[PDB]
Paper text:
Through this study, we aimed to design a series of bifaceted, designed ligands which could engage G-CSFR either in a non-signaling ternary complex, or in a 1:1 stoichiometry, outcompeting native G-CSF. By modifying designed G-CSFR binders, we engineered hyper-stable proteins that function as nanomolar signaling antagonists. Thus, the resulting designs can be used for inhibiting or homing to G-CSFR-expressing cells.
We use this approach with the aim of blocking the granulocyte-colony stimulating factor receptor (G-CSFR) signaling, a crucial driver of granulopoiesis, that when dysregulated can promote tumor progression and inflammatory diseases. G-CSFR is activated through ligand-induced dimerization of the ectodomains of 2 receptor subunits, which leads to the cross-phosphorylation and activation of the intracellular receptor-associated kinases. The native ligand (G-CSF) engages and dimerizes G-CSFR through 2 binding sites in a 2:2 receptor:ligand complex that juxtaposes the receptor subunits into a signaling-competent configuration. Here, we describe an approach for antagonizing cytokine receptor signaling based on designed cytokine mimics with idealized structural and biophysical properties.
Author numbering: 4 to 88, 96 to 124
Amino acid sequence: LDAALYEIYDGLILYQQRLKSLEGISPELGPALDALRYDMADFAILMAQAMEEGLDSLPQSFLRKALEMIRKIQADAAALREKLARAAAAQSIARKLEEMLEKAYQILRHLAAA
């Protein structure tokens, strides 16, 4: 589970940076991309805190904060996907992003039900 979170953390950073290449496709998508990148950056910081402290030692309040954050990001990622539907490449990144965010959710879902 811990090793799985390290790999998902790597995904968060990768796809957050990959979203920066979608800039310039449309002015309507700009603010959606930026907000998503900044929220993902905050979530990565939170997952960094979780790993360094220890997943077995995480309090319920922390897990609730993390679950709240990832679900909001997942909703916003879905909205980005819907708006996108260069364009094809953006959809591929958005698709892989969604999958990675779901993996992050499943880690936290498992920790919360432990």
